Amino acid sequence: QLRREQVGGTKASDFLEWWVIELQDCKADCNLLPMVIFSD
Amino acid sequence: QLLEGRPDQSVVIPHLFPKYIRAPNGPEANPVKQLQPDEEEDYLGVRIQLRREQVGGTKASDFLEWWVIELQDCKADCNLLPMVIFSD
C-alpha cells in the first residue's frame, strides 16, 4: 500500500510515498503481522 | 506538544543518560557502577528539539522534522555531547 501525503511527477514527488504491507486474508489485525519464529 | 507544532519548547527527559560507560571484550558494554552509584540520579539529561523546515497536519508535514538533543545543563557546547567510554 502506497499512502500519499500532500505537502505545500512533481505532484507525485509532492506526495510522500511509503510501502505498507497488510495480510492478504486480514480481518481485524490489519495493522500487524504475527510471524512465528523458533528460538533454538 | 513538540511533535504537534508550535514555537520552540523543550521536553521532560529526567537524566537517563549515564556519563561514564565501560566497554569490555564481553558480549555487551555496561555502564560504570562505581562512577554512577546513584544510577539514574548520576546520569545526565538532554532535551528533544524539533526544528521545522518550510518547503514550497499538511502544514506540519510541510515542515521537515528532526529530533535534536542538547544537554539539560549546557552552557557553551550546546551542539555537542561528550560521553565517556572505557575501552578495555
Binding site: 511509503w18 510501502w19 495480510l23 523458533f38 528460538s39 | -
Partner: protein, 144 residues
Amino acid sequence: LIRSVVGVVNQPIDVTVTLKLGGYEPLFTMSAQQPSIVPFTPQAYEELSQQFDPYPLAMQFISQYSPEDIVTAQIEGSSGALWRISPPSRAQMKQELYNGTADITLRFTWNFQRDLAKGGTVEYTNEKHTLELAPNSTARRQLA
C-alpha cells in the same frame, strides 16, 4: 558430565524484516523490538499443538522446541517510515515496469538478533527470499 548440557534457550532480543524491490532501494523495513516479541506461554504451546494435532511430524517438531523455544514477532505492518525514492530511480522504475519487458525480483529478507548474553554464536542470523516476477502480467501492472 563434561558431555551433559542444559538446553538453555536462546531467544532473539530483536528481529528485523525488510522488503526490497530490484537493486535500487528497500521499499519497506520493520523491526519489532520488545513488546511486539511475544514468547509463547505454555498455553500458546498447547494451542500450536492441537492446531497441528493430526500431523505427526508437526507434533514431534513442536515437542522438541519448548514454548520458551518458540516466539512470535508482531511486526507492525503499517507503522512505517517514509519511503524516500530518488526520482531518477522512480522514473526508471516506472518506465521499465511499463515497457521494459525484463524480469525484476524482490529481495525480501529476515534477520534475527539474539540476546548475546544467551550466547547464540552468530547473533544476526538471516535468510533472503528472492522470487522473480512475471513481465506482461497483472502483478507488474498493479505494482506500476
